[PDB]
């Protein structure tokens, strides 16, 4: 974290992992 | 039972040599107290055999002390 992402603009929900499980 | 019995057994033998140790310390205290009645007070000791044997054992112990000293 040389630079912090803007995390304050997201509501809290877990994204689906892109290598999605079958 | 296979687990528990070897335990109460050990407690039993522990109580046993507890009694044994009590008796032996009774022997020791008899030793110093009868010693105290014989040397400090007077007129009374046990048989000449007891006295002679006691003396012999004392001499042997003293020899062991002289040997273990060096």
């Amino acid at each position: 974290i040389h630079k912090g992402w803007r995390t304050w603009e997201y509501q809290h929900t877990r994204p689906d992992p892109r290598p999605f499980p079958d | 039972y296979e687990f528990h019995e070897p335990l109460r057994r050990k407690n039993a033998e522990d109580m046993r040599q507890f009694q044994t140790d009590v008796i032996d310390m009774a022997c020791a205290m008899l030793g110093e107290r009868l010693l105290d009645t014989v040397n400090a007070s007077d007129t009374s000791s046990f048989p000449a055999e007891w006295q002679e044997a006691i003396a012999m054992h004392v001499e042997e112990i003293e020899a062991e002390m002289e040997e273990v000293a060096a």
Partner: protein, 166 residues
């Protein structure tokens, strides 16, 4: 003085016949005569069979009864021992030779490990457990002096009296 003799065929043949069967009358096996190849081997062989020749405690307890009068006098003591405690100390499962190794060094007492050798009598001075519990014995003795005198009765009865009065 420090002479550790390593055996051979013939000197084993005569030394064992002279020493352990002549003096100690001890009986070797074939495996024995396989392993008797030092002076340390022969000495702890003889030592082992001699210490095995000595009576166990079961034989000593049946030559020495504890007489009813003695045990009765032991019964009339105000205190009898607790005597479960040995089962509380931690046992660890490891090699026996590493246990040999750690008190070969000073490593056995360090990391919370300690070795337990049951004692009989202790060091009484500067022993803080000893003192507190013999103080306790003193007040139990003066307590029974109070009981045999009868003030215990009076104290309890006046407790009941002041409970009834309130």
């Amino acid at each position: 003085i420090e002479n550790f003799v390593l055996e051979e065929e013939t000197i084993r043949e005569r030394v064992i016949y002279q020493v352990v069967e002549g003096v100690f009358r001890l009986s070797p096996t074939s495996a024995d005569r396989r392993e008797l190849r030092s002076v340390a081997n022969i000495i702890d062989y003889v030592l082992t069979h001699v210490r095995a020749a000595r009576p166990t405690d079961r034989e000593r307890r049946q030559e020495r009864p504890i007489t009813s009068a003695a045990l009765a006098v032991m019964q009339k003591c105000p205190i009898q021992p607790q005597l479960g405690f040995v089962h509380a100390l931690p046992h660890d499962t490891r090699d026996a030779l590493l246990q040999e190794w750690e008190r070969m060094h000073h490593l056995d007492w360090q990391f919370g490990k300690a070795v337990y050798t049951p004692r009989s009598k202790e060091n009484v001075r500067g022993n803080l457990t000893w003192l507190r519990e013999d103080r306790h014995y003193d007040q139990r003795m003066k307590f029974m002096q109070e009981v045999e005198s009868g003030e215990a009765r009076a104290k309890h009865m006046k407790l009941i009296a002041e409970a009834a009065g309130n």
